Design a protein around this ligand. Structure first.
Ligand code: XHF
Ligand code: XHF
Ligand code: XHB
Ligand code: XHB
Ligand code: XHB
Ligand code: XHB
Lengths: 114, 114, 114, 114
């Protein structure tokens, strides 16, 4: 139901071994840890959640971009990249969060399919 | 020392009347409100802070993209766009945070000058 | 060796049935048709070429964005999106050209892997 | 009536000294040279044309990204970034073409005002 894909705009490659933390907003407006992992050699992170657990609500996907750039020896601007969105039940729908990283910039999009 | 510029990729226009909230991480690791404003007819937000008040720190620039799209009658994907960065850690700099918005995507970059 | 992936930033979806034309630069500096097709329901276009035919050289990938937006009833800015690059033999390497489309903007990146 | 702004996503700076060539499609369907210039210290290129000369037409704004990256000692992916659009077909407009550059990626948008 939820996949993350991360690309590197400097090297033209998947962004490999990037830590990704997913949080769900709780009733008291705090961010509860939900799922996490590291991107694969294809820049993808699968297996974060299941349809049973991924209920409607507000989610935050935090991509640890600073550590990624530092491990490449490159000085980055952002602490991390944060993608915050609402999951809404609207028929069967898979969410892909994609991010394209540069040292001082990033782009993110959602691919939501049935 | 801190300016925000927001563009609309659907209309090919400045993103006008976008609310922007800036936070600064406090010594107890909470986000403290630091400044806020709205983008002008040119999509720019000036006057958020002064060189005196804009000390070293970790800052979060929250661009209220959902309220922007909904005020135009559009249901967007993201709750907001969040830009988090350490500022002024090598002395005062001037920061422009630019964002380019679509209903399911956004790109952000920083222009940092001395 | 060469794949094209096209995403829609307005709808948060693959860009389906987008015409894509690939050209190779000829010795007289003209653009010779090389391969073409339409993106699938996943926004992907596979099978454009083979390793035997995809020799080093300058290539142009033209994505017919204007017709895509017009078929959705949306007025776009660009005539098409053009991605021009050199293919260089540098060990075994697959090229993915990705593009993320909005009516007045697009982003493109290359994912080049072994 | 036509301005070009170019930013560097690796350095977080204006892209300075970027060559830009503008073409206009002629009645015989060839690209005729129309104007050219280079971006300034602020990453902006002004003065390309006048309201009198900038008639209706299909225009191509070629941003010489490869020479930019190579002059900085970097081997980039794309030959250039090409922005192709019909202009002034509903009367004179002011066009800003903005581009945000990385070695393997770029994003471009247009700001069109009346
Ligand atoms: C973010 C982003 N993503 N993609 C692009 C092409 C952009 C930035 C565009 C921009 C930034 C500034 Br500052 C400007 O003054 C103007 Br005009 C345009
Ligand atoms: C271009 C561009 N600009 N901005 C972003 C976030 C993109 C690329 C998104 C992308 C690329 C590939 Br290949 C995928 O498989 C998937 Br899913 C998504
Ligand atoms: C996505 O672009 C992607 C990779 F980065 C690597 C692969 F082996 C396959 C892919 F689709
Ligand atoms: C900045 O790019 C900008 C706009 F987007 C719109 C305007 F009317 C004036 C500007 F400077
Ligand atoms: C890429 O994002 C993508 C689609 F658009 C659709 C799919 F079924 C699978 C994918 F990886
Ligand atoms: C435009 O954003 C801009 C730069 F990128 C750099 C400068 F020094 C001045 C500018 F207006």
């Amino acid at each position: 139901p939820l996949m993350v894909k991360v690309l590197d705009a400097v090297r033209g490659s998947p962004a490999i071994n990037v830590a990704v933390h997913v949080f769900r907003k709780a009733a008291d407006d705090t961010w509860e840890p939900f799922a996490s992992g590291k991107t694969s050699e294809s820049g993808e992170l699968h297996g974060l959640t299941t349809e049973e657990e991924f209920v409607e609500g507000i989610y935050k996907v935090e991509i640890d971009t600073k550590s990624y750039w530092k491990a490449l020896g490159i000085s980055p601007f952002h602490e991390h990249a944060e993608v915050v969105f609402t999951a809404n039940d609207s028929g069967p729908r898979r969410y892909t969060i994609a991010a394209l990283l540069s040292p001082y910039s990033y782009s993110t999009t959602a691919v939501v399919t049935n």
